[PDB]
Every structure is written in structure tokens, then in C-alpha cells.
Design a protein around this ligand. Structure first.
Ligand code: HEM
Ligand SMILES: c1csc(-c2cnc3n2CCC3)c1
Length: 289
């Protein structure tokens, strides 16, 4: 099973920058969502969930086929709440109907990270919409109630190593949990991309509590929360080291996140030798828009 990247016919960097800009402008303008967090965090989560279905063993799942558009994947309980991100992107897709679904969903994530003052994430085009029968079954995204061994084993399926895992988890500095979506409540309503996840892990006083959905989570007096899988990064000696590294080096964290997130979004895709090199998009700020 091979998924070969195929550039949307006749499209070049300038076409994709226009799509980036349309998403970025909407992010700026629809700022009310989720008590003024806006749509950045949910779009990052969407890009991760459409990618996180990949299995390195058979090359099924991943971002290529844009299969979240199909009912089976759209209604996965693990994807509860991501419909808000789908609805955000819908008008954009109507404006630029030439772009594939996988390309749009993944570009949404890249745009969100950059517009939230994160690192630049190189991005490649050419994902191709695949038919409904290529939709992966539910159950491939991870559980939050587990420990460090689970997290490590889970991520081996996505060909991610310890450093890549800890860097990717830094995105949890963004946004919040919603009891109705996942059975967890709380967060920090943050919409700026920083290394604060790692700082909060090391510096807050965490207490284990049972929430109103009968799930255990770690809570701090500052009003923050960690999932059990978040907290596992300071329980495991190998993860802890890396957590300390990112807490003390913002630039390192940005560079490692950029690499891991691009890899996550590209897993399962074969890029021909003639393919364009990755694009790096300018932010609205860089364009004076
Ligand atoms: C062990 C792996 C992971 C687990 C178990 C996990 C679990 C969760 C849960 C339960 C939520 C709350 C969802 C809600 O109630 O709305 C959440 C939120 C979020 N996750 Fe993860 N996650 C993991 C990895 C990641 C990764 C790798 C990224 C991206 C690089 C990511 C990005 C996000 C973002 C941005 C939110 C906030 C969404 C919002 O504010 O609507 N997560 N995660
Ligand atoms: C902001 C302070 S803690 C925190 C957090 C920890 N784990 C998660 N979040 C938000 C999404 C999941 C976000």
C-alpha cells in the first residue's frame, strides 16, 4: 500500500499561500469561539487527529486520504468536538475547492501554529482524497487515562521516538479540555504557542482528583490540569529529562516541535523525486496584513 503525493493540477506556492492567508484571516476575525480562545487550538488538534490514525505496519490511515470527511471517522468518539474545526474550514474549502481535504486539514494545523506565534512548519502539498472504504476504523487514537509505558508503545505505531513524543505533547499548552467532549475539564485558555506546558509540569503543585465524569486528572491551585498521559512525562526518567530540556530551552523546543509535527503530517506519504520542496508560508504579520 503506497500513497503517492500528487500536486493539485497547476498549483504553486502562491496558490497555497492564499489558502494559508484565508485561514489566518478567519482565525483573526472569528475570535469569540470557546470564550475568546478562538479556533487555533482546535485546528491543531484536528491536524493531529487526522494524522494520528496512521499505522506504520500496513501504511493505513494518516493524513493522505482526507478520510475525516466520512461519517465513520467524523463520528469517532475520540474526535468529539473537532466538528467545530471542520465547520471553520468549510467556507475556506468552498472558496478554494481545488485543494484536497488532507491538504486543507493539515494546512489548517500549520496555519494555526504559526499564527499563534509558534515555529515555522514546512509543509508539503499533494495529499489525494481517497474513497470511503479507505477510512480507518475507530480506536486508533490514544486514551488519556494511561501511563508512560502506554504513551511510548502507542507512539511507536506512528514511528515516533521519546524526543518526538515529548516535543509533540508540548502542544498541550494550548486550549483546554471540555467535559462534554472527552470527560476532562480544565486548562488555561492559552492561544499563544510557548513552552509553558513543560514549565507548568515542573513548577505547579499537582493534586490527583476525580472529576465530575468520574475520571482521574491532575489539578493545580492555579486552575490548570494535566491528563494522566501528560503527567506521565514527569513519572518516566527518559521523558523527564526531555521535559527539563524544553522547559529550559524555548528555541530547542520550537525546532524539535517543527520537525516532529511536519513528520506527523507527512507519515505514510511518498513524495516523488520531482515533487516541489516543502513550502514555508509567511504569517499575516510578515506580509503586513
Ligand atoms: C497521548 C497523546 C494524547 C492524548 C491522550 C491527548 C488527549 C487530549 C484530550 C483528552 C484533549 C481534550 C479534548 C477536549 O475535551 O476538547 C486534548 C486536547 C488537545 N490536544 Fe491532545 N492528546 C494527545 C496528544 C496531542 C498531540 C500530539 C497534539 C498535537 C501536536 C495535541 C493537541 C491538542 C490540542 C491543541 C488540544 C486542545 C484542543 C481545544 O482546546 O479544543 N494533543 N488532548
Ligand atoms: C494549559 C494549562 S494545562 C493545559 C493542558 C494540559 N493538558 C492539556 N491541556 C490543554 C489540552 C490538554 C493547558
Amino acid at each position: 500500500l503506497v500513497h503517492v503525493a500528487s500536486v493539485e493540477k497547476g498549483r504553486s506556492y502562491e496558490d497555497f499561500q492564499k489558502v494559508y492567508n484565508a485561514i489566518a484571516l478567519k482565525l483573526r476575525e472569528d475570535d469569540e469561539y470557546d470564550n475568546y480562545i478562538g479556533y487555533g487550538p482546535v485546528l491543531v488538534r484536528l491536524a493531529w487527529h487526522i494524522s494520528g490514525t496512521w499505522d506504520k505496519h500496513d501504511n493505513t490511515g494518516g493524513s493522505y486520504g482526507g478520510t475525516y470527511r466520512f461519517k465513520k471517522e467524523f463520528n469517532d468518539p475520540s474526535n468529539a468536538g473537532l466538528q467545530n474545526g471542520f465547520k471553520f474550514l468549510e467556507p475556506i474549502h468552498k472558496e478554494f475547492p481545488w485543494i484536497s481535504s488532507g491538504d486543507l486539514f493539515s494546512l489548517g494545523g500549520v496555519t494555526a501554529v504559526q499564527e499563534m506565534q509558534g515555529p515555522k512548519i514546512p509543509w508539503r502539498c499533494g495529499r489525494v482524497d481517497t474513497p470511503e472504504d479507505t477510512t480507518p476504523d475507530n480506536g486508533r487514537l490514544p486514551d488519556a487515562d494511561k501511563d508512560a509505558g502506554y504513551v511510548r508503545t502507542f507512539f511507536q505505531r506512528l514511528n515516533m521516538n521519546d524526543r518526538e513524543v515529548v516535543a509533540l505533547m508540548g502542544a498541550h499548552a494550548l486550549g483546554k479540555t471540555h467535559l462534554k467532549n472527552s470527560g476532562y475539564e480544565g486548562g488555561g485558555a492559552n492561544n499563544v504557542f510557548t513552552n509553558e506546558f513543560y514549565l507548568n509540569l515542573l513548577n505547579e503543585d499537582w493534586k490527583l482528583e476525580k472529576n465530575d465524569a468520574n475520571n482521574e486528572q491532575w489539578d493545580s491551585k492555579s486552575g490548570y490540569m494535566m491528563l494522566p498521559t501528560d503527567y506521565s512525562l514527569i513519572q518516566d526518567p527518559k521523558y523527564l529529562s526531555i521535559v527539563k530540556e524544553y522547559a529550559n530551552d524555548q528555541d530547542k523546543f520550537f525546532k524539535d516541535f517543527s520537525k516532529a509535527f511536519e513528520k506527523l503530517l507527512e507519515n505514510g506519504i511518498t513524495f516523488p523525486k520531482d515533487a516541489p520542496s516543502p513550502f514555508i508560508f509567511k504569517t499575516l504579520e510578515e506580509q503586513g496584513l
